[PDB]
Design a protein around this ligand. Structure first.
Ligand SMILES: CCCCCCCCCCCCCCCCCC(=O)OC[C@H](COP(=O)([O-])OCC[N+](C)(C)C)OC(=O)CCCCCCCCCCCCCCCCC
Ligand SMILES: CCCCCCCCCCCCCCCCCC(=O)OC[C@H](COP(=O)([O-])OCC[N+](C)(C)C)OC(=O)CCCCCCCCCCCCCCCCC
Ligand SMILES: NC(=O)C1=CN([C@@H]2O[C@H](COP(=O)(O)OP(=O)(O)OC[C@H]3O[C@@H](n4cnc5c(N)ncnc54)[C@H](OP(=O)(O)O)[C@@H]3O)[C@@H](O)[C@H]2O)C=CC1
Ligand code: SF4
Ligand code: SF4
Ligand code: SF4
Ligand SMILES: [Zn+2]
Lengths: 94, 207, 114, 178, 342, 156, 144
């Protein structure tokens, strides 16, 4: 999910790139600007939205102590889908 | 019962408290505000002019054989007009007790040396001067011990910036190590961590 | 008012010490330049000694002057012996730092300094 | 209880045999030929040396080395810009400038660590409440220029798309102690 | 004016001065000092180099984190110049050698390369381009080096108008080839000279004064189409100059006459060495060429640098030529040379 | 055959002798030098790579700047670095020597030996493991393995 | 006697690598004629061996590849070539090689290990990751 700017430079997942006229591009001459190609916006969206039975569902990373602090989501909204604040997972009911 | 709270051996509080008074009325000309802390350690505050008589007494006296000078520190407190509060930690090896002796000073109020009494002071005695600018009388050598040969400063004073005023680098124009004013690449990040709540009500200061 | 003295009854007495310390430096510049191979000549070395004194010629507290003299003697002891090398002695001459300007317009052009 | 180390017990007891024992000792270097004997034994022992490139010395799962920003199994970054790994870092090596990610999540826009300032103390991995930053076993990342030790979020995620096969096993084998 | 280029700080390391510069002679003798004065302040100096990465090692000082970027290039091969002068604002061309090699003539080091740097900079879009020639760069000259630089100076300007042509005199410094040359004549029992050195006048200039001039040439709004001549003061007479070198270097002084035709052929012999030759036919003529007067050019004073006299900064370079029993002598015992306005 | 080919082999010969006889200097400042001894200890013997410690800078090829470099010591380190006959290399070891490390913000620490001597390889850590320094020494040996100093001489 | 036994073991090591050419490729390249059980191999070519008889530290070793990413590493062998799944085992952090206990697979873990790069191209070069903080003013493109 990496897109190249018009100057040929690679845009990172934070949206940064150096303009064609910026002198700081010199550091990449004869070298490369490493960018991580596994974006976070795209990968989290490709997950399926889980469906649960209760109106309040817990979320942790999955392993318990290896995850993130125990949080509780409210799933009364129907127009939107409740999102865990730490990990970007989503939950619905029905 | 209470595995967290430290055991309190109150016996050694009485012994120290008795000795502090004994020193108080056997050397009244200088002794000020003797005190004993929770942690059972005695603390005697001495007028600066009485450093030699108090330190000489506490070493030679039969009932107070404080022959080992543990260290000679200095606390900078800009709040009080007499900033530098010189501290002497002493040890006995006979009565197995530690006693602290404190005096005050100032950047224009030197203090009499102690190398005559405790030779251990000699190097500690310069360390204070090199770090705090507290001149000491009657010292033999008295030169900087820690800082570079060209610091026009006194690093441990609270008015001295942590990064200092000068940095060293190598220059080819002059082919020697040169000194230039400090320009940090990433400024030291002062974290305002103080909480706004009374952690300890036992130390409240009314207005 | 009512401040204890330190090696000085009055300013005039402490001025003698400063004049004693100056005679110790003026007699010493020609020995450091040779003992440690400095690139300066003795004539301009003595100028810097004098300059470092006029930097502190506006002081009038007897106690301060004595401390200045005490530090100067320590500065002299580290130079009488070669404890401080060519790197330290040539640090006073400031042969690398750009001469900071004084004109307000020059300051206005470069930097936000007052 | 003390113990005398160089104090003679009882003296003034020497006969011809005892006198000649000392003469033989001094006059034929007995206690110097005794020292040679120990070194000669050591020659006939297996050296402790190990071919470093080919066999590498032992380590432990808790080892603290190169840093790494982890991710959840789904792919989402663990770091949530809580910024208490730069609060405890006693070298001010970490810097964070997080802003909202435009999908609503709290994520970082800068996570640069200066490995020349870092002291590999491990406080940042025990402060993080999501295990976002860890310290893998990679102790061998020496460089030929100062600049490559100034890690940024892109490097720290690369170290973390690389050592997860190792980092996960290490955390999985010591998190109970933590 | 990109926001990055804008100057910042009090001036020094870890600062920004907006002087992104490509120095094409950094590995040399003058290049060391030019980079230093660029790196001492806040400047990102791009240093093209062809030498060993070891010979450029000493240049990794005098610049904060990432204020230096080292790139490889070959003078014959085009498209390595453009890759280096692309993002720069000022290009400082110091390329120059005092002898022919197997691959490079003087035409290929003083005329061709500056054209390639100049053409590759004008197209790239640099603002300034500072070029160095010699003061005696007249077309009607005797030295092969000086004449070639005369053409290169004209050819650089034609391709890249509004260039700054710097014309230093013989530059003296620590690792120079002027005071370190005459001082090295001791290895022969005497110091050959043409006409005992009379009828020849030198006006040496200190490197730091030159490098200060070059560094301030990429700041001052004027001096964008001017030609300078960094000569320095005190036009000595070559006999008096060399006699003074041996005055500081307490060795000897036995000058004797020598025709320039023999003293060139002997010099031509030393030019056959595969390594850096000690002398060459071209260096004989440069040492024996009177330096023109600076009257019709701005000079150092018109740019903000104070010329430094030779007597002040001569012991720094000539100390290593002294021997024990004379290593500790000072500037006082030298009876300095006599200036001549001839 | 081409004369260039012979040059490179001589270049590789001079480099090889400089790779397998890399003599450092017994110049451990503090607190990394303990792990510079372990590198010399039985487990990670440096005599394997023909690496022998010598006190005199005149007989030392590489300088392992291990430990915090302070202002008082800065003039001494540069002097010692100057004495080493060329070619010479510097191997900054540890955080205190690479940058300022734990004392980056102190008043009497030069923020990294790179400000005083030109460093060839940086070995991160605090202290670097004895292997980490050994990887640095080997990675320095591979630096000499590609010098190209005689190859460029033919091109000059 | 026992001398024949050890001289017999030496024959096993000198003649236990396929042939003479096999011995040469390891003697001058690893300085280690030992032979032990072949635990496994990487996709890059690294061969991992173990010999439980020998002492701790010398009971697990690698014989690296001759080529990893078009590098020609027959001689220039460096420690930063053991992939993560084996770096754990080779360093005596576990008893289970990844052949019997494979690492958990994820859709973002690197497939092709990259050795340490310090002077070769494809090098790390640090940069800031935040965007612009202050936006300047663009003037109108037509007079007044
Ligand atoms: C392989 C070659 C091996 C050579 C032997 C090396 C010494 C091995 C260690 C032996 C040992 O442990 O000794 C312990 C003991 C240590 O003695 P001790 O210190 O415990 O003495 C106890 C008290 N008295 C003195 C009364 C015995 O030493 C000996 O056994 C021998 C000591 C006498 C050796 C005299 C050697 C004289 C050399 C000159 C003669 C010419 C020699 C030939 C030259 C060729
Ligand atoms: C003078 C006459 C030659 C004297 C013998 C010199 C031989 C040098 C040598 O053994 O090179 C082996 C070396 C052996 O490789 P190496 O020792 O340099 O590489 C390191 C080896 N490991 C990975 C095990 C640490 O061969 C080469 O590296 C190639 C360069 C050879 C240069 C000489 C060419 C002729
Ligand atoms: N007395 C003096 O020193 C005078 C100097 N100048 C000018 O000063 C400039 C430099 O002076 P100085 O530095 O003392 O001379 P140097 O020979 O010391 O500088 C040489 C520089 O030019 C580079 N260079 C030379 N030939 C080539 C080439 N064919 N291809 C690529 N790069 C090349 C060298 O690279 P490498 O290091 O790889 O050779 C080195 O960087 C020159 O332009 C000279 O004309 C002017 C008047 C007199
Ligand atoms: S290991 Fe310690 S010093 Fe290094 S970044 Fe983490 S908290 Fe800071
Ligand atoms: S790495 Fe962990 S502790 Fe640091 S900012 Fe991210 S979530 Fe917080
Ligand atoms: S980097 Fe760490 S181990 Fe090395 S000297 Fe500094 S504090 Fe000690
Ligand atoms: Zn969650």
């Amino acid at each position: 999910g990496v897109q190249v700017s018009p100057s040929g430079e690679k845009i990172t997942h934070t949206g940064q790139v150096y303009d064609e006229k910026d002198y700081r591009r010199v550091r990449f001459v004869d070298r490369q600007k490493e960018v991580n190609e596994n974006f976070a916006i795209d990968l989290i969206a490709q997950q399926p939205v889980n469906e649960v039975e209760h109106r309040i569902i817990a979320c942790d990373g999955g392993g318990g102590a290896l995850g993130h602090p125990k949080v509780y989501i409210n799933l009364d909204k129907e127009t939107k889908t409740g999102t865990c604040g730490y990990c970007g997972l989503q939950f619905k009911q029905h | 019962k209470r595995p967290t709270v430290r055991p309190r051996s109150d016996v050694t509080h009485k012994q120290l408290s008795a000795f502090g008074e004994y020193v108080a009325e056997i050397l009244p000309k200088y002794v000020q505000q003797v005190q004993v802390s929770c942690l059972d350690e005695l603390e005697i505050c001495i007028h600066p002019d009485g450093v030699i008589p108090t330190l000489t007494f506490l070493r030679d006296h039969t009932n107070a054989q404080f022959k080992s000078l543990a260290d000679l520190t200095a606390v900078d407190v800009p709040t009080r007009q007499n900033r530098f509060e010189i501290v002497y930690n002493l040890l006995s090896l006979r009565f197995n007790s530690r006693i602290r002796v404190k005096t005050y000073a100032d950047e224009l109020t030197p203090i009499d040396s102690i190398v005559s009494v405790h030779i251990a002071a000699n190097w500690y005695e310069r360390e204070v001067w090199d770090m705090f600018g507290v001149f000491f009388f009657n010292h033999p050598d008295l030169r900087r011990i820690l800082t570079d040969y060209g610091f026009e400063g006194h690093p441990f004073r609270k008015d001295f910036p942590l990064t200092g005023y000068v940095e060293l680098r190598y220059d080819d124009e002059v082919k020697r190590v040169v000194a230039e004013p400090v320009e940090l690449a990433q400024e030291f990040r002062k974290f305002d961590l103080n909480s706004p709540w009374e952690a300890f009500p036992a130390y409240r200061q009314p207005p | 008012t009512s401040v204890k003295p330190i090696f000085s009854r009055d300013l005039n007495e402490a001025k003698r010490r400063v004049r004693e310390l100056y005679r110790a430096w003026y007699r010493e510049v020609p020995n450091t330049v040779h003992l440690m191979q400095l690139d300066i000549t003795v004539k301009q070395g003595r100028d810097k000694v004098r300059e470092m004194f006029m930097k502190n010629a506006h002081v009038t507290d007897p106690r301060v002057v004595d401390l200045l003299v005490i530090k100067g003697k320590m500065e002299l002891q580290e130079t009488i012996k070669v404890w401080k090398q060519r790197t330290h002695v040539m640090r006073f001459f400031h042969e690398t730092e750009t001469p900071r300007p004084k004109d307000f317009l020059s300051k206005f052009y470069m930097g936000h300094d007052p | 209880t003390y113990k005398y180390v160089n104090k003679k017990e009882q003296e003034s007891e020497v006969d011809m045999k005892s006198a000649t024992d000392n003469a033989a000792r001094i006059l034929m270097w007995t206690e110097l030929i005794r020292g040679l004997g120990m070194t000669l034994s050591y020659l006939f022992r297996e050296p402790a040396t190990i071919n470093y490139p080919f066999e590498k010395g032992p380590l432990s799962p808790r080892f603290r080395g190169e840093h790494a920003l982890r991710r959840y199994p789904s792919g989402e970054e663990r770091c949530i810009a809580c910024k208490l790994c730069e609060a405890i870092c006693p070298a001010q090596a970490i810097t964070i400038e997080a802003e909202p990610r435009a999908d609503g999540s709290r994520r970082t826009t800068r996570y640069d660590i200066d490995m020349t300032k870092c002291i590999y103390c491990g406080f940042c991995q025990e402060a993080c409440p999501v295990d976002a930053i860890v310290e893998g076993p990679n102790f061998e990342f020496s460089t030929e220029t100062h600049e490559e030790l100034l890690y940024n979020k892109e490097k720290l995620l690369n170290n973390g798309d690389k050592w997860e096969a190792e980092i996960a096993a290490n955390i999985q084998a010591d998190y109970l102690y933590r | 004016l990109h926001h990055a280029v804008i100057p910042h700080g009090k001036g020094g390391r870890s600062s920004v001065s907006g002087v992104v510069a490509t120095v094409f002679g950094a590995t040399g003798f003058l290049g060391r000092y030019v980079v230093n004065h660029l790196g001492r302040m806040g400047s990102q100096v791009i240093i093209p180099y062809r030498c060993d990465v070891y010979d450029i090692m000493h240049l990794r000082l005098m610049g904060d984190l990432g204020q230096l970027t080292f790139l490889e290039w070959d003078a014959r091969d085009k498209d390595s110049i453009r890759k280096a002068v692309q993002h720069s604002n000022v290009v400082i061309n110091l390329i120059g050698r005092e002898w022919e090699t197997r691959n490079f003539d003087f035409e290929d080091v003083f005329v061709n390369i500056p054209r390639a740097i100049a053409q590759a900079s004008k197209e790239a879009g640099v603002e300034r381009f500072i070029h160095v020639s010699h003061l005696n760069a007249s077309m009607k000259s005797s030295s092969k080096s000086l004449r070639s630089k005369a053409v290169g100076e004209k050819e650089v300007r034609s391709v890249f108008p509004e260039a700054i042509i710097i014309r230093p005199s013989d530059i003296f410094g620590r690792e120079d080839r002027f005071l370190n040359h005459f001082a090295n004549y001791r290895w022969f029992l005497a110091v050959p000279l043409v006409s005992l050195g009379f009828k020849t006048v030198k006006q040496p200039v200190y490197v730091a004064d030159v490098s200060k001039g070059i560094v301030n040439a990429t700041k001052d709004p004027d001096a964008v189409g001017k030609t300078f001549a960094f000569t320095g003061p005190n036009r000595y007479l070559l006999f008096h100059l060399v006699k003074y070198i041996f005055g500081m270097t307490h060795r000897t002084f036995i000058p004797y006459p020598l025709p320039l035709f023999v003293y060139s052929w002997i010099g031509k012999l030393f030019g056959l060495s595969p390594f850096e030759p000690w002398t060459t036919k071209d260096k004989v003529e440069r040492i024996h060429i009177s330096d023109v007067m600076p009257t019709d050019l701005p000079g150092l004073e018109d740019l903000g640098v104070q010329p430094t006299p030779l007597e002040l900064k001569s012991i720094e370079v000539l100390r290593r030529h002294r021997t024990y029993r004379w290593l500790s002598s000072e500037i006082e015992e030298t009876k300095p040379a006599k200036t001549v306005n001839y | 055959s081409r004369a260039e080919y012979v040059v490179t082999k001589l270049d590789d010969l001079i480099n090889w002798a400089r790779r397998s006889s890399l003599w450092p200097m017994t110049f451990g400042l503090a607190c990394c030098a303990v792990e510079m001894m372990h590198m010399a200890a039985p487990r990670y013997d440096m005599d394997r790579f023909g690496v022998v410690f010598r006190a005199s800078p005149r007989q030392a090829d590489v300088m392992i700047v291990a430990g915090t470099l302070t202002n008082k010591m800065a003039p001494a380190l540069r002097k010692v670095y100057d004495q080493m006959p060329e070619p010479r290399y510097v191997v900054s070891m540890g955080s205190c020597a690479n940058g300022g490390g734990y004392y980056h913000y102190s008043y009497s620490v030069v923020r990294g030996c790179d400000r005083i001597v030109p460093v060839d390889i940086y070995v991160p850590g605090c202290p670097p493991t004895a292997e980490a320094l050994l990887y640095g020494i080997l990675q320095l040996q591979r630096k000499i393995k590609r010098e190209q100093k005689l190859k460029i001489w033919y091109r000059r | 006697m026992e001398l024949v036994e050890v001289l017999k073991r030496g024959v096993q090591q000198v003649t236990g690598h396929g042939g003479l050419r096999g011995l040469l490729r390891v003697f001058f390249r690893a300085n280690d004629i030992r032979i032990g059980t072949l635990v496994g191999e990487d996709k890059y070519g690294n061969k991992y061996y173990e010999d439980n008889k020998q002492f701790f530290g010398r009971h697990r070793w690698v014989i690296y590849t001759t080529e990893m990413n078009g590098k020609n590493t027959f001689w220039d062998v460096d420690g930063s070539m053991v992939p993560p799944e084996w770096h754990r085992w080779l360093h005596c952090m576990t008893d289970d090689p990844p052949t019997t206990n494979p690492p958990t697979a994820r859709k973002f873990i690197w497939t092709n290990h990259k050795f340490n790069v310090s002077a070769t191209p494809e090098q790390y070069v640090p940069y800031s990751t935040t965007r612009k903080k202050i936006h300047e003013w663009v003037p109108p493109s037509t007079p007044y």
